[PDB]
Design a binder for this molecule. Structure first.
Ligand code: UA6
Ligand code: DG3
Ligand code: MG
Length: 644
DNA sequence: CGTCCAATGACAGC
DNA sequence: GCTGTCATTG
């Protein structure tokens, strides 16, 4: 009962036996064998990997029980030349693709990355039910550290730890078979992983059943990984010319601000050095000392802090947005455009999806700069960095967002009749909040003030104190306390929900979302008042924000299911590359924004996808409050117009 | 000693 | 070599 590797591509008879057994397995694990070219004498043939030089996919290991790993060589020549590589890739695709009535699940560590490699390198598109142990580890503890192969074996299969004795890459987040840096062969690494991943998943599936989270794992979380896989293969269009255009006009404003600021100070100073800013603003002037955004917003009434704040916003866009975007862009010759390919991250505390390298979610909102014209000398020009994100030639960006998703969930749980009343009016909650605060007409509220009222809204709802609220509103703490107390007197059901949530969390030790995902907050019983209250606010926010993330995932999964139904074309822009012209059809998931789904849709399918997206988002889950969706389309992420 | 939540990511002065 | 702070987004 020791580790046995059966090289199935060595004998035609042994291969056909392997294909015979594999085709009747309803559960198996696979691990891609990736290896780096470390010596020309030992260099193995295989399929090259995009973005990696000297790294190839040499094979693939399959395990369906015990410590027997079946290694499937993807090299150009086998021990039996009658079994050509083309014959092997045929059987490989035949077994990794299922029929309608057939039911079969494949267990893969780091499924999204493996799905992309098989498609872009080996030309294999998986058509099975997917299970990833990394996702199962996250469902049991969303605040856990990102799982490694070593930690999974340490916690769910500890007897097989000596198998990972010499391989230090098992203690890395990357898969053992994908980490070609190890001096071990990809054949041994993939075979080891196949055995550890298959048996560990049976233990994880048992725990998920006992936690009543296996349905969420199979019907929501894993299909959401498949959707993000298509997103990572699609990427988001990027227009270097537009981004450079903004970099030029933004740098012109910075030059104008610097000149205008040097006149106000009587000399030249460096905006980077806070010492030079501190000497001017305080030692050279009459401003109350004790350069922070909070400090400079207080001192915003001579015009120098305002000019310093603007200089630091624009500089942040150039240095921390323009620079990474221009770096991570690459050419897609199959679409004739430049695209940015970010990486999805679903191991979050509440279940939200963020992205990395680069995090296109953090691309700045539209902001105005004033530049001298022939008349105004301060003419407003909008700087929309999202305008640089464009669809393929002949398509449009489709954005569909939930209208106050978290508030509707909060109404669903608190049953606060005043909140249900506010949502049913159809008026913007945040403009009304700003309309009473500033005593202005609602139609006059600008986005800056509306954003300020938005943070005042969710802040007060999620436990903000009077001191911070007074800092936000520029009023005294005692005056801000009236606004909080007035909120608690108006919306009593919300407060009753907050009280009930904290009480149950203190007893249960956790809080649950609508789908049943548990987040464990042991600080709910902490003695430290700060750490205790932070846990109390986490308990209330996780239920609402996490349930909002559940609804968006279900809608994404439901949308993509409908899209593949109508359009027999390529699932993703990676299926066009991995399979090698043909016109683009359908809509392509490009970005998720917590409450918004971004889609790159071809013109002839804009109406059809829009109907699909709106209907599926509105019927994701059934709530006591209706889920309202607004669909926008436009030639860019920054030129979205309302679509009926 | 720090009281809206979630997130990525560049720096710093411990 | 960093934990913390602080830009930005939701
Ligand atoms: O009630 C809201 C706002 C509000 C409305 C709706 C919601 C909802 F629907 F999302 F639940 C939440 C809020 C709040 F921000 F407080 F959380 N006040 C309360 C008040 C008042 C007041 C006092 C003297 C004179 N005039 N007016 C608010 C709080 C801070 C700034 C401005 C107004
Ligand atoms: N706790 C907290 N949650 C926030 C904050 N900003 C946003 N969120 C959460 C609540 C709703 C969700 C989506 O944010 P949006 O910016 O889309 O808010 P929105 O109400 O949809 O605004 P809009 O209708 O203008 O899109 O993110 C904040 O400042 N604090
Ligand atoms: Mg929104």
């Amino acid at each position: 009962e020791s580790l046995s590797i059966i090289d199935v591509a060595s004998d035609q008879n042994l291969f056909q036996t392997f294909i015979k057994e594999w085709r009747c397995k309803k559960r198996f694990s696979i691990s891609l064998a990736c290896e780096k070219i470390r010596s020309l004498t030992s260099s193995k043939t295989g399929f090259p990997i995009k973005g990696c030089d000297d790294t190839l996919v040499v094979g693939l290991a399959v395990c369906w029980g015990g410590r027997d790993a079946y290694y499937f060589s993807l090299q150009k020549e086998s021990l039996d030349p009658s079994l050509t590589l083309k014959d092997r890739m045929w059987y490989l695709q035949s077994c990794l693709r299922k029929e309608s009535d057939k039911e079969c699940s494949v267990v893969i560590y780091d499924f999204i990355q493996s799905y992309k490699i098989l498609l872009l390198s080996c030309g294999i598109s998986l058509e099975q039910s997917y299970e990833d142990p990394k996702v199962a580890c996250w469902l049991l503890d969303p605040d856990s550290q990102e799982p490694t192969l070593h930690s999974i074996v340490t916690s769910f299969l500890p007897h097989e730890l000596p198998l990972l004795e010499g391989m230090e890459t098992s203690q890395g987040i990357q898969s053992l078979g994908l980490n070609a840096g190890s001096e071990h062969s990809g054949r041994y690494r993939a075979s080891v992983e196949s055995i550890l991943i298959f048996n560990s998943m049976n233990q994880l599936n048992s725990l998920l059943q006992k936690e009543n989270l296996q349905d969420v794992f199979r019907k929501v979380e894993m299909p959401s990984q498949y959707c993000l896989a298509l997103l990572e293969l699609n990427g988001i269009g990027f227009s270097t010319a537009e981004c450079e255009s903004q970099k030029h006009i933004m740098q012109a404003k910075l030059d104008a601000i610097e000149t205008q600021a040097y006149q106000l100070a009587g000399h030249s100073f460096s905006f980077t050095s806070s010492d030079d800013i501190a000497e001017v603003l305080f030692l050279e002037l009459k401003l109350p000392p004790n350069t922070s955004k909070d400090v400079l917003n207080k001192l915003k009434a001579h015009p120098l802090p305002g000019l310093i704040l603007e200089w630091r916003r624009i500089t942040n866009a150039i240095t921390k947005v323009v620079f990474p975007l221009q770096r991570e862009k690459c050419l897609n010759p199959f679409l004739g455009m430049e695209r940015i390919y970010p990486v999805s991250q679903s191991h979050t505390a509440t279940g939200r999806i963020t992205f990395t390298e680069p995090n296109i979610q953090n691309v700045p909102r539209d902001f105005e700069i004033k530049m001298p014209t022939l008349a105004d000398r301060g003419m407003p020009f909008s700087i929309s960095m999202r305008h640089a994100f464009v669809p393929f030639p002949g398509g449009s960006i489709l954005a569909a967002d939930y209208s106050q998703l978290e508030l509707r969930i909060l109404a669903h749980l608190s049953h606060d009749r005043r909140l249900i009343q506010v949502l049913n009016t159809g008026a913007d909650v945040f403009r009304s909040i700003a309309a009473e605060w500033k005593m202005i007409e609602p139609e006059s509220v600008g986005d800056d003030l509306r954003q300020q009222a938005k943070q005042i809204c969710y802040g007060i709802i999620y436990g903000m104190g009077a001191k911070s609220l007074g800092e936000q509103m520029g009023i005294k703490e005692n005056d801000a306390a009236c606004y909080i107390d007035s909120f608690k007197s108006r919306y009593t059901g919300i407060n009753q929900f907050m009280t009930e949530t904290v009480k149950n969390c203190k007893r249960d030790g956790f809080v649950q979302t609508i789908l049943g995902r548990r987040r464990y907050l042991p600080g709910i019983k902490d003695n430290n008042p700060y750490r205790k209250a932070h846990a109390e606010r986490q308990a209330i926010n996780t239920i609402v924000q996490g349930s909002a993330a559940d609804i968006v995932k279900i809608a994404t999964v439901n949308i993509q299911k409908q899209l593949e139904t109508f359009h027999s074309t390529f699932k993703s822009h990676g299926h066009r590359e991995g399979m090698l012209f043909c016109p683009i059809r359908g809509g392509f998931f490009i970005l998720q924004l917590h409450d918004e789904l971004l889609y790159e849709v071809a013109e002839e399918d804009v109406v059809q996808v829009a109907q699909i997206v709106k209907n599926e988002m509105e019927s994701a889950v059934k709530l006591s409050v209706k889920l309202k969706v607004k669909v926008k389309i436009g030639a860019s992420w920054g030129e979205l117009k309302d679509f009926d």
